[PDB]
C-alpha cells in the first residue's frame, strides 16, 4: 500500500521507478517488488520530507538525490531498467554511511541468497576508520523480470586518501585474483570507482573506472581495443573542441589473461549541452543509428519528470557505449531523479 507520501523522498522516487517499470515492460508484481525494494534500500531516507535539504551532498547525483536511473538499450529490444542507490545516505558522516551501505548489501545477500565473501575480502581497503571522500558505498540493482534483481556494489579507491588511490585499487585487484588487470588500464586522471558483481559467481568479476579530464575521440578509440564505433559515439555525444571529460570502464570477468572482456565509454553529456533537449537529441540519434528503442528513451524521460526538456540540463546525466566480447554493443542512458533541484539551462 506504500507508507510513503509524494512529499517524501521515497514517495517521489518510488513513483518515478513505478513509471519506469512500465517503460521497461515489467509486470505489476515485479513492479511492486522493485518499488518496495527501492524504498527499503533507502532506509530512513525514504520517509524524509523533500522540504528538508538532502542529508548528504552526495556525488551520486548533481542535486544530491541518492537515487539515479539507467536504461540499457540492446538492438531490437525493450530497454533493461537499473537503479543506483546510496543506502547509507541518511547518515551523518562517511563512516556511518558506509556501515549502513554494507548493512543494506548484507540484507540483500540474505534475501537473494548470494555470498559477500568477495566483498568481505576488501573491507579494510574501502571502509577504513576515518574514510576520505567522496562516497562510501553505492548499489546498482538491475530490475530483471522475476523480481530477483542483479546486484552490483560500487566502492571508493580514494577511501584511504587520494595519495593511496592506486595503491588501494592495486591491492583490491590482487586480493580478488586479478593480478594483471591493473596493467591493462589506460593512463588516467582518477580511479573514481571500483564495481564488484554480487551473485552466483565463483570468481570475482570487477569493473575499474578511469577518469580522463581531456579525452580525445582518437584516445577513446585507442583505449577501446570497434574503434570506429567508439570514435563516432564520442563525436555524436560530445557534439563535435577536440577534448572532453569522459570516463572509461574496464571489465574483467576472468583472472587468467589480465585482459578485459568489456570496455565502456561513459560521456557526461550534461556537461556538454545547453539543455536536456540537446542531450535527448544526441542520445536518440545514437540509439536510432544502432537499431535501439529510441521511442522508449522518450517515454522514460517523461516517466521521470513532466517538465519540458529545454527547461533545464542534467536530466540526461550520461550516455555510455558498452562493448563486451561476444555480445552486441549496448547503449546506456542515465537519467536523474531531480528530487531536489533542476539545474538551469547553460
Ligand X SMILES: CC(C)=CCSP(=O)(O)OP(=O)(O)O
| Residue 264 binds which entry of ligand D0Q, ligand X, none, CB below 5-8 Å type-dependent | ligand X
Which residue has 509486470 as its cell numbers? 27
Specify whether the CB–CB gap between 293 and 254 falls below 8 A.
Answer: no
| Rounded Cα distance, 227 and 61, in Å | 30
Q: How far is the CB of 136 from ligand D0Q (least distance, A)?
A: 13
| 77 contacts ligand X (rule: CB under 6 A) | no
How many chain residues are in contact with ligand X, going by CB under 6 A? Answer: 10
Q: How far is the CB of 249 from ligand X (least distance, A)?
A: 5
Span near ligand D0Q by CB under 6 A; candidates 42-50, 59-67, 71-79, 161-169: 59-67
| Residue 205 binds which entry of ligand X, ligand D0Q, none, CB below 5-8 Å type-dependent | none
Judged by beta carbon, residue 4 or residue 151, the one nearer ligand X is 151
| Rounded Cα distance, 119 and 123, in Å | 7
Span near ligand D0Q by CB under 6 A; candidates 42-50, 60-68, 122-130, 179-187: 60-68
Q: How far is the CB of 134 from ligand X (least distance, A)?
A: 11
59: helix, coil or strand? coil
| 237 contacts ligand D0Q (rule: CB under 6 A) | no
Q: What are phi and psi of 184, to 5 degrees?
A: -85, -10
Residue among 277, 261, 249 at smallest CA distance from 346 = 277
- Cis omega (within 30 of 0) on the bond before 128? no
Q: How far is the CB of 229 from ligand D0Q (least distance, A)?
A: 19
Residue 53 burial by Cβ neighbours in a 10 Å radius (0-12, 13-18, 19+)? exposed
How many chain residues are in contact with ligand D0Q, going by CB under 6 A? Answer: 12
| 323 contacts ligand X (rule: CB under 6 A) | no
What is the distance of C-alpha 120 from the center of its chain?
A: 22
User: Interaction with ligand X in 97-136: which residues (CB under 6 A)?
Assistant: none
Interface pick for ligand X out of 69, 126, 154, 182 (rule CB under 6 A): 154
Interface pick for ligand D0Q out of 31, 67, 68, 205 (rule CB under 6 A): 68
Longest dimension (CA), the chain: 52
Length of the chain: 346
| Rounded Cα distance, 124 and 144, in Å | 32
| 97 contacts ligand D0Q (rule: CB under 6 A) | no
Judged by beta carbon, residue 4 or residue 72, the one nearer ligand X is 72
* Helix, strand, coil abundance in the chain, percent, nearest 5: 35, 20, 40
| Residue 34 binds which entry of ligand D0Q, ligand X, none, CB below 5-8 Å type-dependent | none
Strand spans (E) along the chain? 67-73, 80-85, 137-142, 150-155, 194-198, 206-215, 244-252, 262-267, 316-324, 330-336
| 334 contacts ligand D0Q (rule: CB under 6 A) | yes
84: helix, coil or strand? strand
Judged by beta carbon, residue 20 or residue 317, the one nearer ligand D0Q is 317
| 234 contacts ligand D0Q (rule: CB under 6 A) | no
Q: What residues are paired with 251 via a beta bridge?
A: 207, 262
Binding stretches for ligand D0Q (CB under 6 A): 59-61, 68, 84, 209, 247, 266, 268, 317-318, 334
- State the residues that interact with ligand X by CB under 6 A: 84, 140, 154, 193, 195, 207, 249, 264, 322, 332
Amino acid at each position: 500500500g506504500s507508507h510513503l507520501e509524494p512529499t517524501q523522498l521515497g514517495g517521489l522516487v518510488t513513483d518515478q521507478l513505478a513509471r519506469l517499470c512500465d517503460v521497461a515492460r515489467l509486470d505489476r508484481t515485479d513492479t511492486e517488488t522493485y518499488v518496495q525494494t527501492l524504498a527499503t534500500s533507502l532506509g530512513t531516507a525514504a520517509e524524509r520530507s523533500l522540504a528538508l535539504p538532502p542529508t548528504t551532498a552526495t556525488l551520486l547525483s548533481d542535486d544530491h538525490t541518492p537515487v539515479e536511473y539507467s536504461l540499457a538499450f540492446l538492438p531490437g529490444a525493450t530497454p533493461a531498467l537499473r537503479v543506483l542507490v546510496e543506502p547509507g545516505w541518511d547518515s551523518g558522516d562517511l563512516a556511518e554511511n558506509g556501515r549502513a551501505g554494507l548493512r543494506a548489501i548484507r540484507a540483500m545477500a540474505d534475501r537473494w541468497n548470494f555470498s559477500t565473501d568477495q566483498l568481505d575480502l576488501l573491507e579494510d581497503l574501502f571502509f577504513p576508520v576515518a574514510p576520505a571522500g567522496p562516497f562510501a558505498l553505492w548499489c546498482a540493482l538491475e530490475l530483471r523480470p522475476g523480481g530477483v534483481p542483479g546486484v552490483k556494489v560500487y566502492l571508493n579507491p580514494a577511501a584511504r586518501g587520494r595519495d593511496r588511490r592506486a595503491e588501494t585499487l592495486r591491492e583490491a585487484l590482487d586480493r580478488l585474483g586479478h593480478r594483471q588487470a591493473f596493467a591493462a588500464l589506460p593512463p588516467a586522471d582518477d580511479y573514481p570507482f571500483l564495481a564488484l558483481d554480487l551473485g552466483e559467481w565463483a570468481a570475482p568479476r570487477v569493473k575499474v573506472y578511469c577518469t580522463h579530464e581531456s579525452l580525445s575521440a582518437q584516445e577513446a578509440g585507442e583505449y577501446s581495443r570497434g574503434r570506429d564505433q567508439t570514435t563516432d559515439f564520442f563525436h555524436a555525444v560530445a557534439g563535435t573542441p577536440s577534448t572532453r571529460r569522459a570516463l572509461t570502464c574496464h571489465s574483467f570477468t576472468d583472472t587468467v589473461t589480465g585482459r578485459p572482456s568489456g570496455f565502456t565509454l561513459h560521456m557526461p553529456v550534461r556537461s556538454y549541452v545547453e539543455h536536456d533537449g540537446r542531450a535527448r537529441d544526441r542520445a536518440a540519434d545514437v540509439l536510432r543509428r544502432y537499431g535501439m528503442d529510441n521511442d522508449a528513451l522518450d517515454r522514460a524521460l517523461a516517466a521521470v519528470t513532466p517538465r519540458p526538456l529545454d527547461d533545464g540540463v542534467g536530466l540526461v546525466a550520461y550516455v555510455a557505449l558498452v562493448h563486451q566480447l561476444g555480445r552486441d554493443p549496448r547503449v546506456t542512458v542515465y537519467v536523474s531523479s531531480e528530487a531536489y533541484a533542476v539545474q538551469p539551462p547553460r
